[PDB]
Each structure stands twice: as structure tokens, then as C-alpha cells.
Amino acid sequence: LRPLYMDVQATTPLDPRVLDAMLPYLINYYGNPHSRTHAYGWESEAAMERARQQVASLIGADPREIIFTSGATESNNIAIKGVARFYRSRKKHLITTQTEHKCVLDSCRSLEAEGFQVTYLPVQKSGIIDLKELEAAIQPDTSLVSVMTVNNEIGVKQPIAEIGRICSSRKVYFHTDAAQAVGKIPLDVNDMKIDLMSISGHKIYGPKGVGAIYIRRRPRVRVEALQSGGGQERGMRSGTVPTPLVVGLGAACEVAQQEMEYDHKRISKLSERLIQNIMKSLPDVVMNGDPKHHYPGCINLSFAYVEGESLLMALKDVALSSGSACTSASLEPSYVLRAIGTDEDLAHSSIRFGIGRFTTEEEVDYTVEKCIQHVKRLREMSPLWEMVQDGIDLKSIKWTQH
Amino acid sequence: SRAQVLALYRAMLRESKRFSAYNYRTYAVRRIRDAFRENKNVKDPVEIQTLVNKAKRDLGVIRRQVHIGQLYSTDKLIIEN
Amino acid sequence: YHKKVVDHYENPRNVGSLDKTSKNVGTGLVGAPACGDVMKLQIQVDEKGKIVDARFKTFGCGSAIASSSLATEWVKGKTVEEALTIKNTDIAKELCLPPVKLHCSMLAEDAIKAALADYKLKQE
Amino acid sequence: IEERVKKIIGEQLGVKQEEVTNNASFVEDLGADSLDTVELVMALEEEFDTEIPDEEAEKITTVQAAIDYINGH
Ligand SMILES: *P(=O)(O)OCC(C)(C)[C@@H](O)C(=O)NCCC(=O)NCCSC(=O)CCCCCCCCCCC
Ligand SMILES: *Cc1c(COP(=O)(O)O)cnc(C)c1O
Ligand SMILES: [Fe+2]
């Protein structure tokens, strides 16, 4: 028997409507979209244009502003590196957040190796950047600002509209990573003053290996192409545009546009149910991230005096994720939890719960029950629990580390 | 059109209960129920006809996807016991 | 997810605690610098110097819990001198831990030596 | 058989067991509209393996009618 999937932040199941839209292009309409002389190319091109319009309609943009990529990693790379390289002559400074995704960070690391100066903005305990630091960090040679729309580990929403207003008022390009936000919360590039936006297909129940980047044309923001070739996608992403993948991404964007309100209500209700049930049973459980600016789909909880790898192993019937270092290949703890000021004792106990379009009340109740039972068992197995129950707080009692 | 809408509702529920995967089956049934109860008090015949057309398109998609999912079926979830 | 670690993590083996105030009980409390994995090991050396009872409590990954339970199983039924013969290499091969989880066995070994030490200190 | 039908009707229509009398109407007494009637008929088909035709499904408007169709078939 297969476990229950509560790991929507890592990837999503393919929506059946998306696969239904894809399948004609995986069997019959297999022509190259860049073929100009026969009907296979024309029909592939028409499907590509329809998908582009669907994505643009979801994010409220012009179709010409949408460029198809292989994923949000490629989109983030294109945004960061292309904007940095195009305006290198005058602007040599980048601003981003310490809690951004690994792609954005590593791109900033590469640009620093290429001679750029990158400012990594700190976050408060809530996980939200303070706008005063952003204003004070902007220099005359700042080209790009990158702030996550919805965090993928703790689910904290950033003030995208205010950041965009600040960036537009200072003549600084603003890029937002909307991989966890597209199709789940309302997004409009015009009202939020977004210049660049990254979209991931498999975070919105679409195909894997496909993505979109939004590039504003009024006012025009320019990027230097990172992939060289025939000049497809207006010269910013060369290579053949995969018709089934972009068709699926467009179908997923259309389904999200049709179902966002219903999905948000259901997911909010389920998230409140999960959080309240866990809090009312297990003591010493806290949620990482500010609940007032939190997307309900991504719930990060830290279970005190229990380690997260052991809890993950206990809940073998539920597919979950943790920021503990015991779950990392390099034994690297979550840097997002470090940035939000979680003490070393409590981020080894984080568990990320994911609720999405296909999560049932049946699953949430089972996950809550098993989590309560196994957290109680592991606490009965833990020495820190005895120290706390005996009244000797862990800050005043020590043991020989190493 | 009361008989037509009820027959379409019955057909969609019958076909959605045939979804091999637990997530797809539960979502399809719940969504059909909610969508039919949301548009219960719609009086414009044009709006009703548009809803029925979307309903038939969704029925065709559901039929195709249920067949595809049984052609490629996996084990049941731990919650399905 | 090796079966040997899964096996010790489920169906708990000698989980508990002993009387700290008892003269013939040695408590070993240690931790790991990289990750926080903290195991408390207690050995009851009663009668003519034999560890009849041993209990453990561990905060840590499934590998740490498996190592602590394995150490508790091994240390039982032998004198204190025989207990010091337990090494981290033995636990590592018994559990077949991956190279990333190398530190877990050494922590359990450090835990046994600590208890044996506490016991000898209280014995004089 | 009658015991199972009452439980199915009470669970599907969301009413207490005592309120489901043999002469209770699904719409007038138990408070269910056409959609709930369709779901109730479909549930009666899953619990007791059978294929109720459209006319026979339509004629089931009360608990007595439901008890009757299952006992007969
Ligand atoms: P009963 O009380 O006798 O009658 C109830 C009805 C609804 C028949 C009656 O109230 C009525 O006639 N109302 C008028 C309005 C109406 O009937 N509207 C319904 C139109 S059809 C509709 O609502 C569309 C539903 C689409 C569902 C799509 C689900 C997709 C799921 C995912 C697929 C992958
Ligand atoms: C998952 C994720 C990515 C990576 O997207 P791909 O489509 O897999 O390249 C990038 N950014 C964020 C915020 C993500 O959550
Ligand atoms: Fe560990």
C-alpha cells in the first residue's frame, strides 16, 4: 500500500485535465512548432500560442511577455544572470533575501564570482523582510531585487506590492520567484509592479520540465540570453519549444485560474484543521513563520524534543519533508530556519506539511493522528523530554558534545 | 432542462467513482458535488446552457482520464483499507 | 532506509531510564557537534560486577536510535571491563550505516564509556 | 435488509436514525433535494449490487419505496 502524499511543495501530481490536454500532442500532433512549411508545425505553433495566452491570462500579462523555459530554475537563472549581465556597464549591485530558493542564491554566488556585489537581506523572526532594510540597501548601481513571493519551506508571504512600489520608485528592476505562488494566491504583474516572474509547471499540477518567465515590455527590461541558438522565444531562450509541455503548462494555468478561489477556501479550512488538531493535542509545538502572512498550503511545524528524521521515519505512511540536517546529503540544516532565528535545538525538529488541490479531510485526520501518536512515543523516548519534565531547562543543563 | 441536468449529474458521479487513483476520485466527486450545489439557483437559460456545455466537456475529460488511469493503475493508498 | 536501522527504530529495544540516585547506576549523557543527536545511556552494574540492566533514551535520527538500542543490547550481561571493548566500527557494520551517517556510531560508543566511567567514579 | 437501508439513508441525507421513518419522504420530511436523491439512489446501488433503471430510480421518493426495491431485487 502506497503512503499518503502530503509533499505538494516538492512537486504536485499531474492534474487529469492537464494530461487530457497534453495527450493529443503526445500521439498525433507531434510536429516541430518552429516548422514553417507544413501543417504539423502550424498546429504546434497554434497550440504554443494558445498556451502562452493562457499563462499570460493567469498572471494578468500580455502574451508577448511570456517566455517558455524548462522550469523555475532556468527561469530564475535567466532573470538573475541576464538582468545582471545586460546592465553590467552601469549597475553592479544585486539585492536578494537570505531565505530565497537555492537557484536564486547560487546564481547570486556565481555573479559575485563574476565581480558583482550582492546584498543578502535579513529576515525577521516572522520570515518577512523589513521594508526599511530594503530601502536602505538600494544603491545607485543596483540593477535587480529578488524577493520570494511565497516561501517554499515555511510558506510566508512577502509584501510583493510594496516591494514593487519601492523598486519602481527607485528605478530598480524587481524580480519575484512565484513558483509556490502562481495559481494559489492572486497575482497581477501590473498592480504589483513586477518586472520579472518565475513560473514552475510542476508546482501548479502541470508537467515537469517546463516553466515560464515573465519579462515586462513596458517599461522594457532587457536580459542577456543564457542559452544560445536559433533565437526562439524572441531570442531569450533558444532551442525547440516542447509542445506537450507548454500545452500542459497552459492547461494548468487555465485550471488554476478557474479553481483558485475554491482551492484556497478548501486548503485554508484543511490547514486550520491540521494546525488546530496538532496544537490542541501535543504541547510545545510551534509554527515556523508568521501566521498572519502565511499561505495555508505550506505548514512548517517544529516538534520540540523530537528530531525530524526520526519523526519522518515513524510516519512512513505519510510522505512529508523536513528541514533537519539528518535528512540532507551534506548534513546541511535548513538555512531558511536559521534566517528566521529558530534556535539550533528547534530547527532539527521541523516538519513541513503540504496541503493542496488533491488533499482530503481523510488524509489530514490520519496524518494528525499518526503524528500525535508518534510524537508522544518519541518524546517518551527522548532525554530532553525528561529534562524538561523534571524542571531543569535545557539552557542550564549541559552534556559533553563531541 | 431539470431532467437533463440531473442525468448529467448522475453520469458524472458514476464515471468519477471509477477513477482508480484515490486523489483523483475524491477530488472529482467532491468538485462535482460542490459545483452542482453552487449553481443550484441559476436562472438565466444562457448561463445554464453554458454550465451544461462545460459539464459535458468535463464528462468527456473524466471518461478519458478514468480509462487511462485504469490502463496504468498502481496500488491503493494506506487510507483506502 | 536499511532494514537493520528500521528494525531497531520500530519495536523499541530497552527504552527507558534507571535510578540515577542508585549507587550501582552509571549515566552517560553525550551529544554530536554537527547535528544534535543526544543519547543518554544508563547501565546497572549490580551483584559481582555485571551489567544486568541497561536502558537508553535518544533524541536523534533513526540511525542514532538504532545505534543506541544496539549498544544497550550489547552492553547487557557483561562486566564493565567487557563493556569497554565495544567500538563504533562494530555498530557501523552491524547497522550498515551510509558514509554520511558515520558519526552516529561514535556517539553511541562515547555514550557507553561515559556510563562506565560514572559508575566507577561513584564506586569509590 | 431494512436495517441497512435505514443506515444508508441516515448517513447520506445527514439526519438522525430516529427521524427516518418508513413513511418519511426524502424531500418533504428528511429535507433533501434532487441532488441528494440522486446520490441516495446511487448509494443504494453500491451497497446492494444492482442497476436501478431510470424509471425505477425516479419512483424512489420515500423510505418505503427504497426498502421495497431492494427486498424485491
Ligand atoms: P432538484 O432540486 O429537483 O433539482 C436540482 C437542479 C440543479 C436540477 C435544479 O435546482 C435546477 O434546475 N437548477 C437550475 C440551475 C442548474 O441546474 N444549474 C446546473 C448546471 S450544470 C453545473 O452546475 C455545471 C457543473 C460542472 C462540474 C464540473 C466538475 C469538474 C470536476 C473535475 C474534473 C476533472
Ligand atoms: C521548486 C522551486 C523551484 C524549482 O523549479 P523547477 O521548475 O523544478 O526548476 C524554484 N523556485 C522555487 C521557489 C521553487 O519552489
Ligand atoms: Fe542525527
Author numbering:
A (entry chain A): 56 to 457
B (entry chain B): 5 to 85
C (entry chain D): 35 to 158
D (entry chain C): 4 to 76
Task: Copy text verbatim from the article accompanying this structure deposition.
Maturation of iron-sulfur proteins in eukaryotes is initiated in mitochondria by the core iron-sulfur cluster assembly (ISC) complex, consisting of the cysteine desulfurase sub-complex NFS1-ISD11-ACP1, the scaffold protein ISCU2, the electron donor ferredoxin FDX2, and frataxin, a protein dysfunctional in Friedreich’s ataxia. The core ISC complex synthesizes [2Fe-2S] clusters de novo from Fe and a persulfide (SSH) bound at conserved cluster assembly site residues. High-resolution cryo-EM structures obtained from anaerobically prepared samples provide snapshots that both visualize different stages of persulfide transfer from Cys381NFS1 to Cys138ISCU2 and clarify the molecular role of frataxin in optimally positioning assembly site residues for fast sulfur transfer.
The ISCU2-bound Fe ion was coordinated by residues Cys381NFS1, Asp71ISCU2, Cys95ISCU2, and likely a water (W1) molecule. Active-site residue His137ISCU2, although oriented toward the ISCU2 assembly site, is too distant to coordinate the metal (His-Nε—Fe distance of 4.8 Å), distinguishing it from the X-ray structure of (Zn-NIAU)2. Similarly, Cys69ISCU2 and Cys138ISCU2 are too far for Fe coordination. The Fe-containing conformation raised the important functional question of which Cys residue of ISCU2 may serve as the sulfur acceptor from the Cys loop Cys381NFS1. The latter is closest to the sulfur atoms of Cys95ISCU2 (3.8 Å) and Cys69ISCU2 (4.3 Å), yet rather distant from Cys138ISCU2 (6.5 Å), which might suggest that Cys95ISCU2 or Cys69ISCU2 would be the most likely candidates for persulfide transfer from Cys381NFS1. Intriguingly, His137ISCU2, which is hydrogen-bonded to the water ligand of Fe between Cys381NFS1 and Cys138ISCU2, appears to prevent a closer approach of the two Cys residues and to hinder direct sulfur transfer. Therefore, either a substantial conformational change is needed to make Cys138ISCU2 available as a direct sulfur acceptor, or one of the other Cys residues may serve as the intermediate or even final sulfur acceptor.
